Nucleic acid binder design. Structure first.
Ligand SMILES: Nc1ncnc2c1ncn2[C@@H]1O[C@H](COP(=O)(O)OP(=O)(O)OP(=O)(O)O)[C@@H](O)[C@H]1O
Ligand SMILES: [Ca+2]
Ligand SMILES: [Ca+2]
Ligand SMILES: [Ca+2]
Ligand SMILES: [Ca+2]
Length: 341
DNA sequence: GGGAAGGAAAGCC
DNA sequence: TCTGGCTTTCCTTCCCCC
């Protein structure tokens, strides 16, 4: 199998640069303003001009401004990025019927039936990069290898505006030399548990007692890492279908007063229904982020679709259950719908 | 013994 | 200072079915 992975560069910030070319060369920071106070919220992303200074996804906007007070700060316009992403995904479908859209800016294409070797795969990658640059002015990084995981690692190694092939020989080298923390699916918590077992490389998971590995990181992640280390990871490219849609908002001030929370909860329901667009959910979950930042949720599944009026009434009962069962104040409140008909 | 199902944990965008 | 958002697996409990 030959997998070609596409990952758009500094996507949100780059789209803003495409829509306003005068921004190019300047540090641009895309913000997610929570509306709680002046500049409260976090950075969604920033272009490398800003990132090279530590301004990146997830840091508080206030911290970003301490680092680059003169950068351009723009509020996220997800809908615009989503429409642009959709057009690019449509261009990629021309290169393969087997495509897995993984996120707003990533796609895996199985090009096994399209090219004969990595030389041809590489040339197709260039063709794709040029087509997207021609049509949308967006640069991307392409990663090519024998499976999805290595195709993604290839992209990580080449971004931004790059292309890289990790052939069979290099896959074996990486199994021995790649920091295991850099393997997709291994976050800080799993990386710490592994470091604690002396596991710093994929190859190391083959010499540890399986039960010891499984007991520390779980059966699925252990089987996952071992399959990669054995160079036997096989996962087909599959069409993805969204399984959940929701909206969660930040309240002006923390609270556990039902009447004060309701307006936010109902606003989150309205926006969620707008985002469902014809999809009818059979399940609704009310999700609350407590003052200490913990996440609590209560849901209900119906034997039928949930009308908006039913979403309103059931959401209150679920929020009451959250308040009746938890003692903390709520900071953020929302809903999530799933189990579509 | 183990499949489902609810909610938390963890991962990545 | 900690936005928003989606997916998958984990842990626990029910019950032989969902
Ligand atoms: N923590 C986050 N909060 C809000 N939006 C995010 C977050 N992480 C990523 N995104 C959005 O999704 C997009 C893709 O994620 P990614 O981590 O690839 O960022 P990027 O800006 O595209 O950087 P890169 O050049 O590494 O590909 C970004 O433009 C942004
Ligand atoms: Ca990525
Ligand atoms: Ca990207
Ligand atoms: Ca990692
Ligand atoms: Ca049951």
């Amino acid at each position: 199998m030959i997998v070609l992975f596409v990952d758009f560069d500094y996507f949100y910030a780059q789209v803003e640069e495409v829509l306003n070319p005068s921004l190019k060369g300047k540090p641009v920071v895309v913000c997610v303003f929570s509306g709680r106070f002046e500049d409260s919220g976090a950075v969604a992303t920033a272009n490398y001009e800003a990132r090279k200074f530590g301004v990146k996804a997830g840091i508080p906007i206030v911290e970003a401004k301490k680092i680059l007070p003169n950068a351009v700060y723009l509020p996220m316009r997800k809908e615009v990025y989503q429409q642009v992403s959709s057009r690019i995904m449509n261009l990629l479908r021309e290169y393969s019927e087997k495509i897995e859209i993984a996120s707003i800016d990533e796609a895996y294409l199985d090009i096994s039936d399209k090219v004969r070797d990595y030389r041809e795969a590489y040339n197709l990658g260039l063709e794709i990069k040029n087509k997207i640059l021609e049509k949308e002015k967006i640069t991307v990084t392409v990663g090519i290898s024998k499976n999805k995981v290595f195709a993604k690692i290839a992209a990580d190694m080449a971004k931004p505006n790059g292309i890289k092939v990790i052939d069979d020989e290099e896959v074996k080298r990486l199994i021995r030399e790649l920091d295991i923390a850099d393997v997709p699916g291994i976050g800080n918590i799993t990386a710490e548990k592994l470091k604690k077992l002396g596991i710093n490389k994929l190859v190391d998971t083959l010499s540890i007692e399986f039960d010891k590995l499984k007991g520390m990181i779980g059966e699925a992640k252990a089987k996952y890492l071992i399959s990669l280390a054995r160079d036997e990871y096989n996962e087909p490219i599959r069409t993805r279908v969204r399984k959940s849609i929701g909206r969660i908002v930040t309240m002006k001030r923390n609270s556990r007063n039902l009447e004060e929370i309701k307006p936010y909860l109902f606003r989150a329901i309205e926006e969620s229904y707008y985002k469902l667009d014809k999809r009818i959910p059979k399940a609704i979950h009310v999700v609350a982020v407590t003052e200490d930042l913990d996440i609590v949720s209560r849901g209900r599944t119906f034997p039928h679709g949930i009308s908006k009026e039913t979403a309103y009434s059931e959401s209150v009962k679920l929020l009451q259950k959250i308040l009746e069962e938890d003692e903390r104040k709520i900071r953020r409140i929302g809903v999530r719908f799933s189990k579509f008909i």
